Amino acid sequence: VFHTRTIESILEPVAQQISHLVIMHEEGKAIPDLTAPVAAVQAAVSNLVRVGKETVQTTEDQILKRDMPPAFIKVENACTKLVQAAQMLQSDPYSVPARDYLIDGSRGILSGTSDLLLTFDEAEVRKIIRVCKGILEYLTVAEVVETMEDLVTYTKNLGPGMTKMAKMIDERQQELTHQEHRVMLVNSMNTVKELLPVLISAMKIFVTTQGIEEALKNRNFTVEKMSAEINEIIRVLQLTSWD
């Protein structure tokens, strides 16, 4: 239901209670005084909005500056509906709009916290994508390597770059809830790592060499296969649904 184990742990217990509450209200007693638990919701919302507003002002990521403020409004407005429901139930424990204001307030808080969490996740995924694109671009440089000096420089750059990408993917896949997505990330990453020494070997033969056309074909083939896997990783990293 939630694509990462952080979002799942945080939201799924509360998302299940809200669904249940909606089903109960549809088919179907006095609601007790909700003053103390609503105040706890208010104190948490106030902290989230204050810290959130501070992030909006300091960040350089224009997407956060754009997507975070509407989500705050969503959580703030939903909290206002919750504060109204508790004030209604204190005066009337059998109140009808109070039960609707609780549902509306719960839905809105979950909606806004979901938006916030998804926005933070898209931002982390953008960071991984930048590292992937970096590798893709460095794979395009392979075709201009003509000498052993260049091969040594290329190998010293690509080697650590691949290790950082492999570590980012390994850590991202552990965090995912859907198995089909984890398998695709692991499979593609393994192929990339396996084909890297094969690329360096193909380029060594090219630096060594009719005969040139064969060594060039194999180097271009490896870059093509590695590039296709990297572009598949970029695609899979952006998936939030279904399998």
Binding site: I10, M24, P32, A36, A40, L48, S106
Partner: peptide, 22 residues
């Protein structure tokens, strides 16, 4: 992560509110 933790506090408090209703 502070923002994620502040979101967690909100969800935990909301969960407590809903269980207090019935």
């Amino acid at each position: 992560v502070v923002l994620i933790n502040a979101v967690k506090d909100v969800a935990k408090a909301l969960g407590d509110l809903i269980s207090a209703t019935k």
